[PDB]
Design a binder for this molecule. Structure first.
Ligand SMILES: [Zn+2]
Lengths: 292, 401, 512
């Protein structure tokens, strides 16, 4: 169908289309509430949902470009708390589809005792390097930091300061994995931060390597449903687009316009490699859905 | 970041030789546009003059042909032997016919992103027979092309439609879309033949699974054909019998490259999971996996000149991979890994299979690598920028007479 | 570069281990066992069962965990490595420390020995490996105190294990960098890297020729390496958790393995399916030592995180997932003193209420450095509430229990912020002035020092055997001596250069 881009609404349309084509998400939306009305309208001006977002959150009151990841994370947890507050008369369906769990393990290198500290997440913020893949970026996200030398870790079992290894690893796999590629990174100067136009390839199938062996179904297969692409050469000076798969055919949503596209044409949205800092049409948020 | 120019192994210090570098004459880096990958092909003309080695590579629209001098100083890049410029569709792959090759005539076919194949004789520049010129046989881009081992006329091509087509130099293509008749149906593959009284050029249509067929590779003996597709299945066939010999599913993603061991007992496979996968031919099972790349794997190849087969010495293999992460990896297969004592049975779990670590893992280019060829005196790599680098083996850099 | 004063509240001998045992050495000529204790004390025992009291002497000079020990020169010389960043040379027969090497910048974690050339190697968390000729270390004097240093470069991470062959030609380092690294100790040349393990390596063994290698790792696997083929031969997985200790017979055919899962197996390298469970210890196994007095090993000494050291005979070992063990009771048992695991300072900041591994609560005095009374197996939390005092005193010291004894540390930042009246503290005309607990303590620690002369403060006296320690913050031990040994001639000469300025002020100048 398509959604109306009133102006700097791209990052709201891009995720909105991307959020829809999640078949488990679009299903349980049938029963905030402004999004459920716009979803029924498709199954198109989003003025009822746009103006409600400006009055709900003061951060989005301005008419400037902003971050789709910030709105995606805010949109999910806002729907989650109103579902939990309305359920007072604990695991909501918003958490059952998106909430994963990763644990921050601390491992003393002498006694080899591991202490856990879980963290629930809806989006998985992953850092980006040049000429890499998302499966390697996830390895970099789960790297092992070492506390040693002047920063030794006091172990209660050893009653002394020993070396230790901090490490993050996913404990519970989500039904839909949202991979946020941190392409907007601080400039390390007073200047506004830049956009990392690195070439990060991502496959259609996916399995995770950085899983804790304590879980059972840790190596489940995933499938790429949607991906929020971002044009422009700046953090707040661009335009958001969405590749997505309704059925076997792949669709492209540029604001209002809709167009069918082949699956091999996704190669153009991996990222630049000559590092010429150009449009950098690159994927920003990736959506993977479980097979089972 | 700065690229590496040398690396050490148990054999010695491999050293890059910049004075043996091949590229466009202007030497400006080819823009790393999506385009199509830069490929390299070699051929020997019976070394009748010692300079019997010929080099062919493509860079976007251009296709060059020089005299390859190996570890010696490269030939004059400003004076090629032949040069072809394609304003239309661009070349994407090519291969020489090593049998019918002499100082007077060399057969070289070139694939294109339109689906066409073109026979070329670069040293005489006389003939030019086009195949599938009308795009009636198949319209998708061709991926891998190679002559049939031992044949002088037959050759096999593979396209992104997940099909393969056997051709013949003597035959001619139809003026209309050819009608096919079934020959052999199999597990996730089908083979047909051209129903025509006159000798049509598409001898047979070989449909291989879903997704694009990224590469095929004949066995060193010739009898078998290993194919990898975008759906992540490695399918090895018997070329003469035309039937399935074995299958293997990637951990995830889809398999980009494939190659055979020198003795033909093993197959390694690169794919979209940043992993190389060793596969046994006699047992039809995965024996090892390798994690050493930061991105997808592009080319895999065995090194016959640093491989010890049989013996009372132990069996050991050497093979390299290059990936889109601009890095080169070298791997060792030893008896502890070879002889240890979404389906997972034909795709074993990570705990059920050994996990290899590379001997070296060096960044050797600014752009994604697309060529890895093992020669007697050197290793040959190439990036998307169109630089054909030559790495002198230890002791093969200088000769004394 | 901040000097701290420290002292330990303990008995004069402490002839049993006050903490677990990191390494074991065995002198078959004198039938003596050496135990490297996590209580900074190396103890000489007697394996001869004809005696009933195995204790012989105590070699104490270290101020932190003694991680590894090596016996050289036919039992005459002992080399020790400890977490106080020092490697000490000892006289193993008489039992005193000869020299101290301070080249490491972090915990010295392991030692390696090569008998055929009398060469020892030290390595640890500072990522460094040093090679020492033992004969040049024993000849160290005050005039010729320096020695040639030969170090190996290579490791990218901390080192936890180190092993040399008997000939003195292969040295292997195991490390939290999972790769094993090999050198030639004569030329210091890097020979090979052995990849395979996926975790830290705390156990390394080499055959006499230096052609094979056994490695135990925290990944739970034992790997037999071929240095000729420069690859792994076999990978044995007989444990559930991290393998930490390894021993091998003289024929290099059977491997004795122990670790975190408290199991101790004897696995055949040629045939791994024949595993014999020797015993399931009470604590994780840290180090093992075979008895090398017969063609097959008759017994094996085991060190754990507990203070007791056991010996297990392997008599029925040739006649035997193995759920049934070979041994249940040890053959010999060397007893171990309990370790103070919990400490609580009281509101008056003078008395401490502890609790050891035997759940025995005790009442201590920090100022006098004495134990008031043992309170048995009473409730620890309720005793803290019952011993509550309605008074506020600022913090003026810190306590650490790494050695298992009470170690008190004084720092210039807050040592003297402890003004307490004398009457209610427990002292006498009855003038009752405000006394500084920190400054009054420094004068009793250096009471026998002639430079600090009234003999002491008057009000109290610390035990004469109390070891006083001067050091650096997270730093190296600077000087160590007993309270009574301050009057020695060469010992007082060191106190003129080792003691910092802020301690000289309160003891000599009476600055208060
Ligand atoms: Zn610990």
């Amino acid at each position: 169908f398509g959604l109306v881009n009133f102006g700097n609404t791209c990052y709201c349309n891009s995720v909105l289309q991307a959020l829809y084509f999640c078949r488990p998400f679009r299903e349980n939306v049938l029963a905030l509430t402004c999004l459920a009305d716009l979803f029924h309208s498709i199954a198109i001006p989003p003025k009822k949902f746009i103006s409600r977002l400006r009055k709900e959150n003061d951060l989005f009151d301005n008419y400037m470009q902003q971050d789709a990841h910030e709105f995606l994370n805010y949109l999910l947890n806002t729907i989650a708390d109103i579902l939990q507050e309305e359920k007072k008369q604990e695991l909501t369906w918003v958490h059952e589809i998106f909430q994963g769990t990763l644990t921050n393990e601390t491992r003393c290198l002498n006694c080899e005792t591991v202490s856990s500290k879980d963290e629930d997440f809806l989006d998985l913020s992953v850092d980006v390097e040049q000429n890499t893949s998302i499966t390697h970026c996830l390895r970099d996200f789960s790297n092992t930091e070492t506390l040693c030398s002047e920063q030794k870790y006091y172990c209660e079992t050893c009653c002394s300061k020993q070396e230790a290894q901090k490490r993050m690893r996913v404990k519970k796999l989500p039904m839909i994995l949202a991979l946020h590629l941190k392409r907007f990174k601080y400039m390390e100067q007073l200047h506004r931060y830049t956009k990392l136009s690195y070439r990060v390839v991502f496959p259609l199938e996916l399995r995770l390597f950085n899983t804790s062996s304590d879980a059972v179904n840790l190596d489940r297969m995933y499938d790429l449903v949607a991906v929020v692409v971002h044009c422009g050469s700046g953090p707040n000076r661009g335009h958001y687009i969405t590749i997505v798969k309704s059925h076997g055919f792949w669709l492209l949503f540029d604001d209002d316009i809709v167009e069918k596209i082949d699956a091999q044409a996704i190669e153009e949205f991996y990222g630049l490699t000559s590092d010429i800092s150009k449009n950098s049409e690159s994927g920003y948020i990736l959506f993977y859905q479980s097979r089972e | 970041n700065e690229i590496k120019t040398q690396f050490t192994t148990r054999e010695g210090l491999y050293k890059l030789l910049p004075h043996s570098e091949y590229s466009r004459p202007n030497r400006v880096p080819f823009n790393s546009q999506g385009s199509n990958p830069v490929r390299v092909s070699f051929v020997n003309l019976n070394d009748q003059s010692g300079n019997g080695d010929r080099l062919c590579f493509n860079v976007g629209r251009e296709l060059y042909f020089y005299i390859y001098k190996g570890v010696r100083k490269a030939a004059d890049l400003s004076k090629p032997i032949d040069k072809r410029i394609y304003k239309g569709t661009q070349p994407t792959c090519h291969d020489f016919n090593h049998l019918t090759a002499t100082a007077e005539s060399v057969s070289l076919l070139v694939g294109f992103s339109a689906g066409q194949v073109q026979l070329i004789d670069p040293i005489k520049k006389e003939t030019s027979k086009l195949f599938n010129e009308e795009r009636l046989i198949d319209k998708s881009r061709v991926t891998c092309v190679k002559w049939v081992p031992g044949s002088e006329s037959l050759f096999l091509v593979a396209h992104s439609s997940g099909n393969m087509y056997l051709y013949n130099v003597e035959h001619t293509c139809g003026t209309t879309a050819p009608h096919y008749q079934l020959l052999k149906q199999g597990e996730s593959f089908a083979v047909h033949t051209c129903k025509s009284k006159s000798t049509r050029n598409p001898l047979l249509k070989w449909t291989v699974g879903e997704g694009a067929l990224n590469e095929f590779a004949f066995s060193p003996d010739g009898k078998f054909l290993a194919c990898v597709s975008q759906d992540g299945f490695l399918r090895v066939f018997n070329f003469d019998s035309v039937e399935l010999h074995g299958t293997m599913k990637s951990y995830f993603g889809g398999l980009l490259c494939v190659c055979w061991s020198p003795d033909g007992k093993y197959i390694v496979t690169g794919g979209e999971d940043d992993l190389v996968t060793v596969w046994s031919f006699v047992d039809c099972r995965v024996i090892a996996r390798g994690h050493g790349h930061k991105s997808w794997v592009s080319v895999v190849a065995f090194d016959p000149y640093t491989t010890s087969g049989g013996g009372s010495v132990s069996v050991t293999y050497r093979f390299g991979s290059v990936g889109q992460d601009t890095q080169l990896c070298l791997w060792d297969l030893t008896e502890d890994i070879l002889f240890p004592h979404l389906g997972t049975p034909l795709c074993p779990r990570m705990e059920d299979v050994p996990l290899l670590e590379p001997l070296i893992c060096k960044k050797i280019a600014h752009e994604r690598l697309t060529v890895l060829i093992f020669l007697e005196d050197c290793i040959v790599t190439a990036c998307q920028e169109g630089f054909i680098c030559t790495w002198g083996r230890p002791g093969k850099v200088v000769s004394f007479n | 570069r901040k000097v701290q004063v420290s002292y330990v509240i303990r008995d004069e001998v402490e002839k049993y281990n006050r903490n677990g045992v990191n390494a074991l050495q065995l002198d078959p000529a004198l039938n003596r066992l050496f135990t490297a204790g996590r209580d900074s004390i190396i103890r000489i025992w007697s394996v001869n069962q004809h005696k009933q009291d195995p204790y012989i002497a105590s070699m104490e000079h270290h101020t932190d965990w003694v991680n590894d020990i090596v016996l050289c020169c036919n039992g005459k010389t002992l080399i020790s490595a400890s977490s106080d960043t020092t490697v000490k040379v000892w006289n193993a027969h008489k039992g005193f420390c000869m020299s101290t090497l301070r080249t490491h910048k972090d915990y010295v974690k392991a030692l390696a020995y090569a008998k055929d050339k009398e060469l020892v190697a030290s390595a640890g968390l500072d990522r460094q490996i040093f090679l020492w000729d033992v004969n040049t270390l024993t000849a160290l004097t005050a005039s010729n105190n320096t020695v040639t240093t030969s170090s190996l470069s290579g490791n990218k991470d901390s080192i936890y294990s180190l092993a040399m062959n008997q000939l003195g030609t292969i040295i292997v380092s195991g490390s939290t960098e999972k790769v094993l690294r090999v050198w030639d100790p004569r030329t210091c040349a890097k020979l090979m890297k052995l990849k395979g393990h996926t975790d830290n390596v705390k156990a390394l063994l080499l055959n006499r020729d230096g052609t094979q290698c056994l490695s135990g790792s925290s990944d739970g696997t034992i790997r037999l390496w071929s240095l000729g083929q420069q690859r792994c031969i076999a990978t044995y997985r007989v444990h559930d958790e991290g393998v930490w200790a390894l021993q091998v017979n003289d024929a290099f055919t059977h491997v004795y393995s122990g670790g975190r899962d408290r199991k101790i197996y004897c696995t055949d390298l040629r045939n791994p399916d024949i595993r014999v469970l020797i015993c399931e210890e009470k604590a994780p196994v840290l180090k093992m030592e075979l008895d090398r007095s017969a063609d097959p090993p008759p017994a094996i000494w085991v060190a754990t995180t507990k203070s007791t050291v056991n010996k297990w005979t392997l008599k029925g070992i040739h006649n035997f997932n193995p759920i049934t063990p070979l041994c249940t009771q040890p053959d010999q048992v060397i007893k171990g003193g309990a370790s103070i695991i919990q400490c609580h300072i009281l509101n008056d900041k003078r008395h401490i209420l502890t609790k050891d591994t035997n759940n025995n609560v005790a009442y201590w005095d920090v100022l006098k450095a004495c134990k008031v009374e043992d309170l048995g197996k009473v409730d620890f939390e309720d005793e803290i509430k019952k011993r509550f005092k309605m008074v506020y005193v600022p913090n003026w010291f810190s306590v650490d229990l790494k050695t298992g004894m009470l170690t008190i540390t004084l720092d210039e930042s807050d040592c003297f912020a402890a003004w307490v009246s004398a009457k209610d503290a427990g002292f006498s005309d009855g003038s009752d002035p405000k006394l500084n607990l920190g400054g009054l303590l420094l004068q009793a620690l250096l009471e026998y020092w002639p430079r600090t002369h009234q003999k002491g403060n008057g009000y109290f006296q610390v035990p004469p055997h109390t070891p006083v320690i001067f050091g650096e913050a997270g730093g190296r031990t600077l000087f160590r001596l007993l309270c009574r040994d301050s009057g020695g001639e060469t010992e007082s000469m060191l106190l003129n250069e080792t003691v910092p300025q802020w301690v000289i002020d309160i003891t000599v100048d009476k600055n208060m």
